[PDB]
Write a protein that binds this ligand. Structure first.
Ligand SMILES: [Mn+2]
Ligand SMILES: [Mn+2]
Lengths: 216, 216
């Protein structure tokens, strides 16, 4: 695993970083990137290698500023992922909201300093997620990890995350993939190396933050 | 394009079919399959080749039976896609809700004859979509097309749909894909042929339905 300072620097440079949560939690790795300058081509890569459910972690302050209420008032999961209502970018270049171009645009607009509620059509195809106020020390999820990286790298308080799946194997001429799953542990590290990305754990990220804040 | 009767038969056989809406509308092709027996391996293929936003078109009767209210009360789009609150399957085999296994399971459970509201955790990772009562003749969307195919093929009234994207080209060692987009027209047909699938247009589907119902 890479050291957190090095992950921060890559994140500051607008790169995706690969982040694993605890094996006792989801045991999943997500691609996490700063939303402010995510490119169409980067989004296409993200869609290709992830679940395709492209989320945008942001702070409670941003959910209030942008008027993004929680999708559900009484969450099935109490520590559950805090989905807000979904969005598309209100921009002349948006078409259906699903393309790599459109999803990247929605993410950059969510992160813009002058963002306003009217900049987003609801519902849509990008899924903002409300990080808890206490950050990664309080909730050890990828949502918090993305917002934490934005803070640590001096970026706008909106990230983009999606889970790295195991697409299994192609089966020539057949609309199936054999032995699919989720990418785990070492495979996640191998994926990062293949793509020139830094890779880390939320546990190490928490250890990093604790150097300044102490244990929660 | 294949003739609608032949698309119906493939759909009845549990295959994906490729369906294009009008060029003046989204100009997009979706993979559409019956939800009732979608397999883990099929879902993995769907995720790999689509946007990854896996939706489940269903009737108004099913949204009431399963207690799936619209995600938003005052839709940004008036003829907009009718997203309900998202779901995961309440089943012992579900883990995080995002894997091909978990999403396929949620779809099969939405389609089960004995489905009940409590079978679904909200929010989640599968996106049910409420088809309009008037079917494809009333709203020429993929949501309606999926429900229409279920009716035509004698299946449970729940389909699975997702847009076929153009993932662009891989760039060795770099986390980007060049020239991504949406797959269109002839390319959609080529995609269907490559994968042994039937391919059609919503316009021809409407023409099929009109043979029995007349023009709306
Ligand atoms: Mn996660
Ligand atoms: Mn569509």
């Amino acid at each position: 695993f890479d050291a957190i300072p090095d992950v921060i620097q890559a994140f500051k440079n607008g790169e995706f970083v690969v982040v694993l949560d605890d094996p006792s939690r989801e045991n999943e790795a997500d691609l996490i990137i700063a939303a402010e300058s995510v490119t169409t081509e980067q989004m296409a890569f993200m869609v290709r290698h992830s679940s395709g459910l492209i989320c945008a972690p942001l702070t409670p302050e941003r959910t209030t500023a942008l008027d993004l209420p929680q999708m559900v008032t009484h969450n099935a999961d109490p520590r559950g992922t805090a989905y807000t209502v979904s969005v598309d970018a209100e921009h002349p270049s948006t078409t259906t909201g699903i393309s790599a171009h459109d999803r990247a645009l929605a993410c950059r607009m969510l992160a813009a300093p002058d963002a306003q509620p009217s900049h987003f059509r609801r519902p849509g195809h990008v899924f903002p997620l409300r990080a808890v106020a206490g950050g990664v020390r309080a909730r050890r999820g990828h949502t918090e990890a993305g917002v934490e990286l934005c803070r640590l790298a001096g970026k706008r308080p909106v990230a983009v995350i999606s889970e790295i799946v195991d697409d299994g194997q192609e089966v020539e001429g057949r609309a199936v993939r054999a032995a699919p799953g989720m990418l785990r542990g070492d495979e996640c590290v191998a994926f990062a190396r293949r793509w020139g990305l830094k890779v880390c754990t939320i546990e190490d990220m928490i250890a990093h933050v604790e150097k300044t804040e102490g244990k929660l």
